[PDB]
Amino acid sequence: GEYIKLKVIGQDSSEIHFKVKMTTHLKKLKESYCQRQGVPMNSLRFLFEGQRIADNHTPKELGMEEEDVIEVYQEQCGG
Amino acid sequence: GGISEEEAAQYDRQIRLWGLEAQKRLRASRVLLVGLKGLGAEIAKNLILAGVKGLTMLDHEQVTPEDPGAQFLIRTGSVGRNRAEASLERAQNLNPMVDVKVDTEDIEKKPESFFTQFDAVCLTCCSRDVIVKVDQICHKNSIKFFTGDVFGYHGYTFANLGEHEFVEEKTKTMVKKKVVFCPVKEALEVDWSSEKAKAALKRTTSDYFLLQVLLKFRTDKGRDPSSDTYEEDSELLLQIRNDVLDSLGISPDLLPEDFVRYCFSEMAPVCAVVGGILAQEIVKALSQRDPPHNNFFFFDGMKGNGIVECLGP
Amino acid sequence: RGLPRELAEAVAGGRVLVVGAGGIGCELLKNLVLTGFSHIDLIDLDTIDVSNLNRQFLFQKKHVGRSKAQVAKESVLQFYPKANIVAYHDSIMNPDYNVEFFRQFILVMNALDNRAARNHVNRMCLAADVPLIESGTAGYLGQVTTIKKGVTECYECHPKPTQRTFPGCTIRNTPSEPIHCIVWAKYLFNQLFGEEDADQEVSPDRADPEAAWIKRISTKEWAKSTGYDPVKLFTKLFKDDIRYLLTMDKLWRKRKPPVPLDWAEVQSQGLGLKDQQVLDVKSYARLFSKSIETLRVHLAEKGDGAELIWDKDDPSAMDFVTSAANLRMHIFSMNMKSRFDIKSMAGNIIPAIATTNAVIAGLIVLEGLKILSGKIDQCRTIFLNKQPNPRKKLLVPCALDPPNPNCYVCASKPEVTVRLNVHKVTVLTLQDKIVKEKFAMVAPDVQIEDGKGTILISSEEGETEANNHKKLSEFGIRNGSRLQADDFLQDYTLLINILHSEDLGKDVEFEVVGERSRKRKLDEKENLSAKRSRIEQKEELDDVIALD
Numbered sequence: 008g009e010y011i012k013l014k015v016i017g018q019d020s021s022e023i024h025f026k027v028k029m030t031t032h033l034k035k036l037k038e039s040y041c042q043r044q045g046v047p048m049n050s051l052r053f054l055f056e057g058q059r060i061a062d063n064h065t066p067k068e069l070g071m072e073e074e075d076v077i078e079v080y081q082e083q084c085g086g
Numbered sequence: 087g088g089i090s091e092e093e094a095a096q097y098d099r100q101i102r103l104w105g106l107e108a109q110k111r112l113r114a115s116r117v118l119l120v121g122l123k124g125l126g127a128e129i130a131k132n133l134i135l136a137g138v139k140g141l142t143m144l145d146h147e148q149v150t151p152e153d154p155g156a157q158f159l160i161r162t163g164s165v166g167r168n169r170a171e172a173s174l175e176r177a178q179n180l181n182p183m184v185d186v187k188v189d190t191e192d193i194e195k196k197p198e199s200f201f202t203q204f205d206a207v208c209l210t211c212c213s214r215d216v217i218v219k220v221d222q223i224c225h226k227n228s229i230k231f232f233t234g235d236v237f238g239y240h241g242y243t244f245a246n247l248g249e250h251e252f253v254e255e256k257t258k259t260m261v262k263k264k265v266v267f268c269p270v271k272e273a274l275e276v277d278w279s280s281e282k283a284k285a286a287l288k289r290t291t292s293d294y295f296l297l298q299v300l301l302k303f304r305t306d307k308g309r310d311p312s313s314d315t316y317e318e319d320s321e322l323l324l325q326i327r328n329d330v331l332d333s334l335g336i337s338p339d340l341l342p343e344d345f346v347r348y349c350f351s352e353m354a355p356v357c358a359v360v361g362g363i364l365a366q367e368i369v370k371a372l373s374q375r376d377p378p379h380n381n382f383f384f385f386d387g388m389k390g391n392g393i394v395e396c397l398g399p
Numbered sequence: 400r401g402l403p404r405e406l407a408e409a410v411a412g413g414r415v416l417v418v419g420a421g422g423i424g425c426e427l428l429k430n431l432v433l434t435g436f437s438h439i440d441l442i443d444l445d446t447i448d449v450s451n452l453n454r455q456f457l458f459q460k461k462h463v464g465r466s467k468a469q470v471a472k473e474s475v476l477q478f479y480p481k482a483n484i485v486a487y488h489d490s491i492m493n494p495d496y497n498v499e500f501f502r503q504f505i506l507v508m509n510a511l512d513n514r515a516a517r518n519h520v521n522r523m524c525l526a527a528d529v530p531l532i533e534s535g536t537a538g539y540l541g542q543v544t545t546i547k548k549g550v551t552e553c554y555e556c557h558p559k560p561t562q563r564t565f566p567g568c569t570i571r572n573t574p575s576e577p578i579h580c581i582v583w584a585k586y587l588f589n590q591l592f593g594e595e596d597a598d599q600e601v602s603p604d605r606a607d608p609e610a611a612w613i614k615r616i617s618t619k620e621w622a623k624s625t626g627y628d629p630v631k632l633f634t635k636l637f638k639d640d641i642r643y644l645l646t647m648d649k650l651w652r653k654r655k656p657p658v659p660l661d662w663a664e665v666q667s668q669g670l671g672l673k674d675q676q677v678l679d680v681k682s683y684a685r686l687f688s689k690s691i692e693t694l695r696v697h698l699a700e701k702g703d704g705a706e707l708i709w710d711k712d713d714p715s716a717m718d719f720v721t722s723a724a725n726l727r728m729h730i731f732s733m734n735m736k737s738r739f740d741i742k743s744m745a746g747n748i749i750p751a752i753a754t755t756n757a758v759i760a761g762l763i764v765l766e767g768l769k770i771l772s773g774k775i776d777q778c779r780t781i782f783l784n785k786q787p788n789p790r791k792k793l794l795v796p797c798a799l800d801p802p803n804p805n806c807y808v809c810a811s812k813p814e815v816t817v818r819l820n821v822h823k824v825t826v827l828t829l830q831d832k833i834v835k836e837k838f839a840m841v842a843p844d845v846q847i848e849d850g851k852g853t854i855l856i857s858s859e860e861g862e863t864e865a866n867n868h869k870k871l872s873e874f875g876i877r878n879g880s881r882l883q884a885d886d887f888l889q890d891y892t893l894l895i896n897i898l899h900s901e902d903l904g905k906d907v908e909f910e911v912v913g914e915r916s917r918k919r920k921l922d923e924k925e926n927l928s929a930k931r932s933r934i935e936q937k938e939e940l941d942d943v944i945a946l947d
């Protein structure tokens with residue numbers, strides 16, 4: 008495969024950068040994220056262009072360019 | 087260290103969000119809020135629960151039978167009574183630690199030095215003229231300026247904080263930061279006849295233009311679209327759209343021809359949303375903690391959109 | 400009123416349920432009435448408390464100790480006595496809120512602060528076939544979404560976070576973070592003053608495998624023989640226990656050993672908010688002692704042999720845990736924390752403010768409307784951000800997802816696999832830790848799926864008490880056995896498939912599905928040497944590098 012820099016932005020306007028191989032299972036990226044950020048995995052939801060990203064989806068499949076953006080949304084459960 | 091144990095227990099859950107310093111700022115802060123219909127009432131409720139030093143609620147208008155039969159600061163049947171005055175009661179109960187004052191004199195009649203007892207001023211229900219005279223005054227005096235309004239399903243806020251210093255939290259504590267606002271005048275009058283401009287107009291919600299329309303109908307008729315006069319008001323709107331699109335160079339469909347349906351009166355849940363946001367912008371402004379949104383917030387209650395636009399420099 | 404013919408009659412027409420009356424709660428009730436919702440049901444299981452007063456605007460200091468639901472209704476009524484509100488003060492898990500009950504509503508709205516009640520309400524609305532709008536806040540954030548049987552995913556289509564769990568040996572033997580010391584102090588409070596619980600011992604664990612190559616006296620028993628004497632408890636916990644740990648020396652080969660404390664030495668050797676000060680050891684010690692004195696009293700004020708329930712708001716329970724955790728901390732060379740921080744970690748306090756709840760409750764009614772006029776196809780999950788996203792969005796409306804076919808709740812004949820040791824696990828553990836606690840059932844009936852239908856658990860008080868203590872293998876349960884769990888109240892039925900396993904790690908009683916340390920550790924170094932032999936030859940499937 009080839010590589011892309013992708014950026015993950017949080018609600019808490021955080022902004023983590025990643026270099027990923029176009030063939031990667033994006034779950035690997037989610038796991039990468041939760042580790043560099045200390046959060047348990049399905050404490051999150053990753054969005055590319057308003058649309059969900061499941062574990063096995065791929066940067067190729069979703070048609071991902073260089074510099075592209077992923078948005079993480081964490082579900083509050085207080086209230 | 088020097089708030090009471092009483093305050094510590096009630097502000098507990100906010101102090102854990104934004105710290106004792108920020109809350110000490112709030113506590114030293116005095117706020118002028120103008121107009122007490124739906125949006126104004128939300129802001130009042132929000133800033134009083136936050137525990138500003140004091141809130142002065144200014145409205146010269148009285149309760150009409152057109153005014154909503156339900157208003158949470160205002161016991162039923164209080165028609166004929168001054169708005170600000172009817173309100174004061176329920177509002178002050180929200181938080182005895184806050185000095186909640188009223189004022190009944192029309193905002194236009196107010197001298198420059200009257201504004202200087204306030205660390206922030208926020209305008210609801212004002213005509214464009216008012217909005218400009220006041221913004222300008224607040225610029226002359228280094229007062230934090232806000233305006234906001236609800237129109238049926240839409241709402242917006244606006245902010246002018248001048249040269250604004252704030253601290254943020256650093257994501258692995260505290261960072262000093264600066265951000266620069268510009269007059270309402272410059273924000274409501276963009277030269278779209280530019281290259282920068284016509285380029286950025288692609289990324290600019292139609293709601294900015296819906297604003298202009300609505301501000302006009304307000305200047306020429308001195309009230310906002312009422313519902314039990316729908317037919318009359320709809321045409322006036324359709325009209326005004328065009329004259330204003332003309333005067334900066336916009337094609338009469340970049341703002342839908344259909345907007346007229348959903349911008350009548352005030353939808354209570356839109357007041358809540360926009361009043362939640364604006365109130366929080368003000369809190370942010372006074373405690374100088376966290377970045378404040380660069381000038382406009384536009385809420386579309388049909389789509390569930392909330393956009394933040396930088397419109398003026 | 401300002402809404403179109405169909406919709407405004409539908410709103411004066413319908414009955415709605417708002418579950419919970421806190422931050423989102425009061426805010427919602429107000430919006431629903433001002434939007435003209437004439438018929439409204441309101442339920443909260445709780446009274447008013449002072450920390451509520453910064454975001455639950457229907458309630459004033461004069462109202463502390465009264466029902467959240469009732470006072471809420473009183474307060475709306477003053478501004479709009481037209482409005483119809485029925486106000487229940489009670490948990491929605493209470494058996495009176497059956498399917499029939501839920502069937503009256505056209506809409507149910509959550510205003511809750513926990514996952515258990517949400518898992519229940521999710522189930523009631525699948526069962527009563529009623530759309531529900533779910534929502535949540537914390538600090539500056541929160542969200543709203545719609546759930547519709549047959550259309551969208553349900554609350555539990557996707558695993559959410561579980562409450563953070565710590566290995567017993569980490570709590571009792573080798574703490575290394577303040578959270579371990581605070582969890583230790585909660586457990587101790589529970590041994591001394593609450594319901595003794597074996598999963599919550601605070602005494603050192605001699606069976607820690609990190610420490611291997613006549614009983615000693617338990618905590619409650621040692622308390623009882625000394626009559627809950629503050630100073631003897633001190634010596635026992637912060638000295639004799641530590642001496643013993645030091646005996647377990649394979650634990651301290653790389654970690655700094657705990658240092659035991661002596662009561663008399665500590666007494667001989669003796670801005671921000673008050674609660675934000677960190678005190679000295681002496682002070683914590685003295686507070687530990689005073690705290691026992693007071694709790695021994697609270698305990699004698701119980702009627703009929705009952706126990707204390709731990710509460711962050713009870714001064715002396717909070718002091719007990721503050722002082723005990725700080726001392727455990729010190730003993731293990733960690734810097735002590737303030738009551739304010741400890742209260743936060745011990746209570747799991749979520750920061751909360753008014754505006755955030757106001758924004759969410761606002762969104763709730765708007766999505767309500769859309770649902771109620773067949774615009775369900777316009778409904779979204781709306782996120783509230785702190786800062787605007789790259790496309791300038793502060794509220795980010797997002798596409799509903801459809802029902803996940805492998806959901807263990809909303810699917811047709813829902814089914815799970817559970818891995819456990821059928822010889823270690825008891826019926827009671829099945830009942831409480833698995834069925835009630837993990838699968839969130841409220842009063843389960845559980846049988847073997849064997850057409851005789853051997854009973855294990857009944858929801859009928861004192862029917863399967865005798866079975867509690869028996870291991871599962873005593874019924875023949877083993878690999879591949881299949882159980883059937885019913886919560887008649889939630890009208891929910893779940894088949895559990897047992898995977899037998901012996902290899903789980905003595906604190907880990909189950910989990911849901913769905914020489915040679917010198918060879919198999921020096922093999923990781925060249926399973927990583929080979930993994931990035933193919934990485935650096937343009938030829939490896941999965942590869943992610945962190946930058947910044």
Ligand SMILES: *NS(=O)(=O)NC[C@H]1O[C@@H](n2cnc3c(N)ncnc32)[C@H](O)[C@@H]1O
Pocket residue numbers: 085086418419420421422423424442443444445467489490491492510511512513516
């Ligand atoms: N976020 S909050 O703290 O302001 N509001 C939470 C609100 O919800 C109530 N609640 C919690 N769990 C239940 C159950 N099981 N039934 C009914 N109400 C429930 C809380 O008491 C709190 O006031």
Ligand SMILES: [Zn+2]
Pocket residue numbers: 552553554555556557802803806807808809810
């Ligand atoms: Zn589901």
